[PDB]
Amino acid sequence: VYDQVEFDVPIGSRGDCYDRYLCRVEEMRQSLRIISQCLNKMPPGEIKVDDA
Amino acid sequence: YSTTRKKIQEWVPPSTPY
Amino acid sequence: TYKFVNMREPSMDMKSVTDRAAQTLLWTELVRGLGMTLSYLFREPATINYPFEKGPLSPRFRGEHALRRYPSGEERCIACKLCEAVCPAQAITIEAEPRADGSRRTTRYDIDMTKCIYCGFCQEACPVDAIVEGPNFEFSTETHEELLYNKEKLLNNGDKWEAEIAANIQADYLYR
Amino acid sequence: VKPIFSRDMNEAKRRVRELYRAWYREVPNTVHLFQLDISVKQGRDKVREMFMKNAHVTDPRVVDLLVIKGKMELEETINVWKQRTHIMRFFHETEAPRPTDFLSKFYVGHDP
Amino acid sequence: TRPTIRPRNDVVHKQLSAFGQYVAEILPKYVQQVQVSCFNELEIFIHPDGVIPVLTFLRDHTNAQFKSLADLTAVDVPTRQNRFEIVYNLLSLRFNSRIRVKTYTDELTPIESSVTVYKAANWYEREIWDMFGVFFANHPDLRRILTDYGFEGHPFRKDFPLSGYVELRYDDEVKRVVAEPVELAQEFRKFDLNSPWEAFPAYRQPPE
Amino acid sequence: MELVQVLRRGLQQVSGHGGLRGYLRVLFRANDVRVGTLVGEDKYGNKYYEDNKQFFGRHRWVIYTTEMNGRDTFWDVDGSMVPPEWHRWLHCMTDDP
Amino acid sequence: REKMFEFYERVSGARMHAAYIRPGGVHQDLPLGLLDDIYEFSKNFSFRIDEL
Amino acid sequence: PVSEVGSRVISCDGGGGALGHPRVYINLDKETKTGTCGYCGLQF
Amino acid sequence: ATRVIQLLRNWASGRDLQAKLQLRYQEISKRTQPPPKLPVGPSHKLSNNYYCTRDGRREAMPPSIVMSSQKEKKAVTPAPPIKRWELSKDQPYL
Amino acid sequence: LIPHGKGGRSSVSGIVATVFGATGFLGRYVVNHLGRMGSQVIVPYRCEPYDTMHLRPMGDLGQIIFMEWNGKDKDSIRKVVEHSNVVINLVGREWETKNFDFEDVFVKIPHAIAQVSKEAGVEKLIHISHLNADIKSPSRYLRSKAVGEKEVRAAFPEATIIKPSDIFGREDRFLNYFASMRWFGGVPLISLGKETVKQPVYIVDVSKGIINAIKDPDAKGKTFAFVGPNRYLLFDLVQYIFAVAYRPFLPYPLPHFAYRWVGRLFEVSPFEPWTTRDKVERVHMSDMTLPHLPGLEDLGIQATPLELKAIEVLRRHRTYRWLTSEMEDVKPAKTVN
Amino acid sequence: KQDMPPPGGYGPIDYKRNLPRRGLSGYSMFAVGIGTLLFGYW
Numbered sequence A: 001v002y003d004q005v006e007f008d009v010p011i012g013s014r015g016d017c018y019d020r021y022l023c024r025v026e027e028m029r030q031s032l033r034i035i036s037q038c039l040n041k042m043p044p045g046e047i048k049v050d051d052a
Numbered sequence B: 001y002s003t004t005r006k007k008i009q010e011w012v013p014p015s016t017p018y
Numbered sequence C: 001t002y003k004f005v006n007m008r009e010p011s012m013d014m015k016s017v018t019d020r021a022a023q024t025l026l027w028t029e030l031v032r033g034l035g036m037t038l039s040y041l042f043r044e045p046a047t048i049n050y051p052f053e054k055g056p057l058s059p060r061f062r063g064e065h066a067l068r069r070y071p072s073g074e075e076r077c078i079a080c081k082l083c084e085a086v087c088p089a090q091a092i093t094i095e096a097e098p099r100a101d102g103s104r105r106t107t108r109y110d111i112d113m114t115k116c117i118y119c120g121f122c123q124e125a126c127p128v129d130a131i132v133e134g135p136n137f138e139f140s141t142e143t144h145e146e147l148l149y150n151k152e153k154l155l156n157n158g159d160k161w162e163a164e165i166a167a168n169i170q171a172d173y174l175y176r
Numbered sequence D: 001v002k003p004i005f006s007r008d009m010n011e012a013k014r015r016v017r018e019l020y021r022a023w024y025r026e027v028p029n030t031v032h033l034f035q036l037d038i039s040v041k042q043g044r045d046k047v048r049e050m051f052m053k054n055a056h057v058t059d060p061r062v063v064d065l066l067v068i069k070g071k072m073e074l075e076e077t078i079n080v081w082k083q084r085t086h087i088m089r090f091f092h093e094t095e096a097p098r099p100t101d102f103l104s105k106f107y108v109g110h111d112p
Numbered sequence E: 001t002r003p004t005i006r007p008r009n010d011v012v013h014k015q016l017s018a019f020g021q022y023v024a025e026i027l028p029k030y031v032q033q034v035q036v037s038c039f040n041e042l043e044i045f046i047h048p049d050g051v052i053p054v055l056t057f058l059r060d061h062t063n064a065q066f067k068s069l070a071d072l073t074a075v076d077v078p079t080r081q082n083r084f085e086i087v088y089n090l091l092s093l094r095f096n097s098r099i100r101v102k103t104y105t106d107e108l109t110p111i112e113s114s115v116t117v118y119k120a121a122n123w124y125e126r127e128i129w130d131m132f133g134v135f136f137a138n139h140p141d142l143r144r145i146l147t148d149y150g151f152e153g154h155p156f157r158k159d160f161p162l163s164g165y166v167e168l169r170y171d172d173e174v175k176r177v178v179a180e181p182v183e184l185a186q187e188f189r190k191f192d193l194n195s196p197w198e199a200f201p202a203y204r205q206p207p208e
Numbered sequence F: 001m002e003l004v005q006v007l008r009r010g011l012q013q014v015s016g017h018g019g020l021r022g023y024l025r026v027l028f029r030a031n032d033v034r035v036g037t038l039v040g041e042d043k044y045g046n047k048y049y050e051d052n053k054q055f056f057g058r059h060r061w062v063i064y065t066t067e068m069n070g071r072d073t074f075w076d077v078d079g080s081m082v083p084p085e086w087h088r089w090l091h092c093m094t095d096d097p
Numbered sequence G: 001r002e003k004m005f006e007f008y009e010r011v012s013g014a015r016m017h018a019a020y021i022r023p024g025g026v027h028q029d030l031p032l033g034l035l036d037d038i039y040e041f042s043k044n045f046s047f048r049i050d051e052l
Numbered sequence H: 001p002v003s004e005v006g007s008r009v010i011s012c013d014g015g016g017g018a019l020g021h022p023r024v025y026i027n028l029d030k031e032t033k034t035g036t037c038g039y040c041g042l043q044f
Numbered sequence I: 001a002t003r004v005i006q007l008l009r010n011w012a013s014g015r016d017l018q019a020k021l022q023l024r025y026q027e028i029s030k031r032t033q034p035p036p037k038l039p040v041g042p043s044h045k046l047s048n049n050y051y052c053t054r055d056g057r058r059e060a061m062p063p064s065i066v067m068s069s070q071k072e073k074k075a076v077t078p079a080p081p082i083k084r085w086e087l088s089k090d091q092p093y094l
Numbered sequence J: 001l002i003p004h005g006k007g008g009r010s011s012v013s014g015i016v017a018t019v020f021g022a023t024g025f026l027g028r029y030v031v032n033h034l035g036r037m038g039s040q041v042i043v044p045y046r047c048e049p050y051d052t053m054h055l056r057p058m059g060d061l062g063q064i065i066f067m068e069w070n071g072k073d074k075d076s077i078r079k080v081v082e083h084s085n086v087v088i089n090l091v092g093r094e095w096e097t098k099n100f101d102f103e104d105v106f107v108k109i110p111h112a113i114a115q116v117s118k119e120a121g122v123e124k125l126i127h128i129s130h131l132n133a134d135i136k137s138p139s140r141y142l143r144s145k146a147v148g149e150k151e152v153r154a155a156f157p158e159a160t161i162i163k164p165s166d167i168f169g170r171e172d173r174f175l176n177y178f179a180s181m182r183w184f185g186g187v188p189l190i191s192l193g194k195e196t197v198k199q200p201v202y203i204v205d206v207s208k209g210i211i212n213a214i215k216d217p218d219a220k221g222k223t224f225a226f227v228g229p230n231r232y233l234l235f236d237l238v239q240y241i242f243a244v245a246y247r248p249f250l251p252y253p254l255p256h257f258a259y260r261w262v263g264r265l266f267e268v269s270p271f272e273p274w275t276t277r278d279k280v281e282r283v284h285m286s287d288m289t290l291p292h293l294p295g296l297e298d299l300g301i302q303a304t305p306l307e308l309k310a311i312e313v314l315r316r317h318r319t320y321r322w323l324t325s326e327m328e329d330v331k332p333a334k335t336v337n
Numbered sequence K: 001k002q003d004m005p006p007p008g009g010y011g012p013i014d015y016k017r018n019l020p021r022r023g024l025s026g027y028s029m030f031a032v033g034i035g036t037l038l039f040g041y042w
């Protein structure tokens, strides 16, 4: 459903450990954005596939 | 401990002579 | 979509320059973080007082195994033996022989926590819902030979906890 | 058909002799540095024996492949890779004796 | 036929098909066949000698800017004139898509290493060497990883017991851990789950 | 308002009854509902946390060997079956039988 | 992170290594009481990451 | 333990609605009957 | 949990923790819950189902193949190139 | 039980050996060679679980079985014999503890062991005594052990009896001892040279020999005695000791009485004294050279020479300057015989 | 009828950083410092 979620990928720059760190943090925040959307559109229905 | 009794229960020679 | 972490760059404005210089000489962010841990000193500690208190769990939680009886007092297990057939660690070993009555039963159901991975496939697999992954989670022991549970041991675990387990399954089965 | 290394036998045998030189000379250093208490001779003899273990291989490429797998071990002992355990491993010293005599085996176990 | 089954796009199957034809014509000194797995995965074959030249172009632009090996898998199969069957995934970025070239190899023939062409394959050469017999030529340093030191026999040889032929244990009389043949308890019970009645008419080889 | 807090220490000091023993073993303090059952003694509580709710107290005579202040109480000591389900918040809403 | 393991705890029955995702989709359905609980946490997590 | 009355075929489940043994049909009245795992015989 | 401390604490923080106090859960979800009832599932209709249709694994097919070399003209891409991404809109920089 | 499978860690064997006082140097090795066979053992502890703990790996899950016991209570020894097929006595002590008077240790305990070995119908009983156990005025151990030797022989006559000719190993209380005599300064020789002479057997050899003795149908009531292949002189021996320990070597000639004044001085310590007058008499009396008794080679095992094996035994005593060195550098000691 | 837990509503959650501009002008720092010095010397 990543088709149906919206979030900002955080590009680094220098390629130093520091940028990777900020990528870690920012990706945390972005996931924290995803949680909102998934909470707001969580349809009723079955969960296992019908195919027994 | 071991469970389910025994296996082969092999026979033994008789007490009586011959 | 794509975002620039960093890339933003400092101003060369003299007020800002003096600010960064004063920052370097006088350690502003340093004292900021230091003030932050000061702030966490005053929050209430998170520790639970175990043993005397114990952590939250869930009805679905998995732990010690225990075969369990019918209310009638009869045991449930019927040696369809697929508990052996679905455990990935294959911890289980079963050797059924007929009851004198002629009902199917185990002779030496056994299991060994030494190899069991507590995945709960056995919990799912049993058609008569005999073996159950019990709520108990503590049974650390001195000697390796004790880990290798016998059938009788499982029954005793099923005796110790039965109201409890039946409570969890009662609270849980609808989701199954 | 692509050969691995040497074409035809003998060209590969020299390789293995070189390898024996390397192992043999290295061995006392092995006993010294590793504090092995094997008799300094014994390692050498055992080396010679391991060299006798495949002393009937006759394929073209297989022998050079054998010296490939032979390099890595001296490669490891020289780099102090492996250890006292790992290099003492070859002597099988903890094993219970197993005579190959038919009757001897015959009394002991069901055997093949 | 909607809710459960995957829709499978025709489009991608088209583009991969045509592109497979495209490469098939560009360099056919060696592309044995350019089969497209129906779930959108192209995968051309290669004569084992031909590994470097193909992959080389596979980085080189035409569209095949498939930089970065994803992996260097080594499927085994006991049959066949040559058992081991090497496989190379690849990814192109700007046209975001993946292909998968692959070859075959004798137990003894030394195929060349492909480290230079895909760049990040140095670790893999060592892997497959220590998980198999197969040797890569022009490789700077094959050596064991994912094993013990000695150990010897390659695993993943499709034969070769999972329990191996050895075990370590610490032995006080010599005060040292030591190798010793497996003596395994409980024995790996071996179910034979596999069952009669072919499930798959859509495949199933001719009886021949 | 420190005086009200210290006063709370006082009221707790009186209500606990010889709190020095409970802090000599159960490590303090505030207590609550004192609901009980089990094979022996036991206890209960309620306060202001999702983890600090529902305490416990080992039987002074224990299952057999005496367990008390300055004694080696078991964690397996807690009554089997029913009480953990209320005690782990498996069903804290469901009061112990 | 422990509060997150409370969630794996809650839906899967294991604190971690939650063999819960299935080739067919997912194992048991998640309990009714969960989503608000995730909400209540997620709203407050950001202060924590921020202070970090 | 004592056998339930019947005339003739009847259900068994071991009494646990989706908690007992999977449903089966014992088939006896005056005769002793069954069973799966539940001993719930139908001798009557 | 007192005003004498919480004010100083928040000022030391520069964040005012009292609005969240996330380092504990004073009163979250109640544990006992009403029974699930729970969803039925799409194919449970008895009136019309046929596994010959609903089946997916039987739709598996042998790979499409080309060349089988074993047994103008124009150039073309594996796929159209993807566009460059727009930059984050609301928060262009961090 | 009939033995099954290749001998191995998982292998069964009929032996349900019971070893007493295995906490010591012997028979930790003897249990180990049982363990490589996979043969079950019931080593019982008098002491504390902790010291026994390293015994645990040697077994295979259910094999090793510690059991609480006392040598003084009759039934207490009835406990650990109670299903044993064979029972083995390795108990010994150099320095006489108080509560265990020096006599009972070599008398009562082997006695109760012997007669209980009778009542339980134990398939085999076996017992140890020093070669010099033959009665002599010096030292009460040779004599008390002679008494329990003759006693068990009088009580379980078909028992074979060990008479080991001094075993040398890494965990030895002997070689390490004279190695540690350096710590005082010199090495107290009553009169140097040929004042006394000794021969040694590798510990490993003794262990292999014992279990082989259970492996030998012929080893019934025979009184086995173990001697190493080489013959040495105590003076040249200690010379070889500091030849491998690289420590400075000072012979220390001494009138015979004063050494006993020393032993009386050092018996005083409440703990475990480094030396004792009993040990003082362990010192100067040479082993007898009699070979005609059944012994080690009769088992078919050949002794491992001490000369290649002392190095590992004593390297821990080495100063860092010399801590790494080949044994061969030291020079094989000359053999008197 | 049936139930399970779809959302009952749920308001928006925070995520963007909110670092306060705590602290103040750099000139003030030197000012207070140097004033402390001169009073000290005096």
Ligand SMILES: CCCCCCCCCCCCCCCCC[C@@H](O)O[C@H](CO[C@H](O)CCCCCCCCCCCCCCC)COP(=O)(O)OCC[N+](C)(C)C
Residues within 6 Å of the ligand: C023, C024, C025, C026, C027, C030, C031, C034, K034, K037
């Ligand atoms: C009449 C006029 C007379 C004089 C008036 C002017 C006074 C002169 C200016 C006063 C400056 C003195 C400050 C001491 C030297 C500071 C330099 C120090 O910070 O070096 C930096 C290194 O910083 C230090 O290593 C900080 C680490 C110290 C860790 C302890 C934290 C201290 C906490 C605060 C305690 C305060 C207690 C006492 C207060 C009264 C290196 O700088 P740089 O390489 O370019 O980049 C890093 C910049 N930093 C500062 C942000 C890290």
Ligand SMILES: NC(=O)C1=CN([C@@H]2O[C@H](COP(=O)(O)OP(=O)(O)OC[C@H]3O[C@@H](n4cnc5c(N)ncnc54)[C@H](OP(=O)(O)O)[C@@H]3O)[C@@H](O)[C@H]2O)C=CC1
Residues within 6 Å of the ligand: J020, J021, J022, J023, J024, J025, J026, J027, J046, J047, J071, J090, J091, J092, J093, J100, J105, J109, J128, J129, J130, J131, J163, J164, J165, J166, J167, J168, J173, J174
């Ligand atoms: N080179 C040698 O050492 C030789 C030895 N022998 C004989 O063979 C035997 C084996 O020697 P070794 O094993 O080195 O001697 P150890 O002292 O190492 O072994 C004796 C063990 O038995 C225990 N033990 C015996 N009796 C008692 C008791 N009544 N109460 C408590 N513990 C007891 C001892 O103490 P605990 O178990 O309590 O710790 C000790 O662990 C000895 O008896 C010795 O006389 C013979 C020839 C040479």
Ligand code: SF4
Residues within 6 Å of the ligand: C076, C077, C078, C079, C080, C081, C082, C083, C084, C125, C126, C127, C128, C129, C130, C131
């Ligand atoms: S499922 Fe439970 S009951 Fe049925 S056989 Fe396996 S174990 Fe016995």
Ligand code: SF4
Residues within 6 Å of the ligand: C086, C087, C088, C089, C090, C091, C092, C115, C116, C117, C118, C119, C120, C121, C122, C123
């Ligand atoms: S516990 Fe998990 S793993 Fe161990 S047996 Fe039951 S299901 Fe298989």
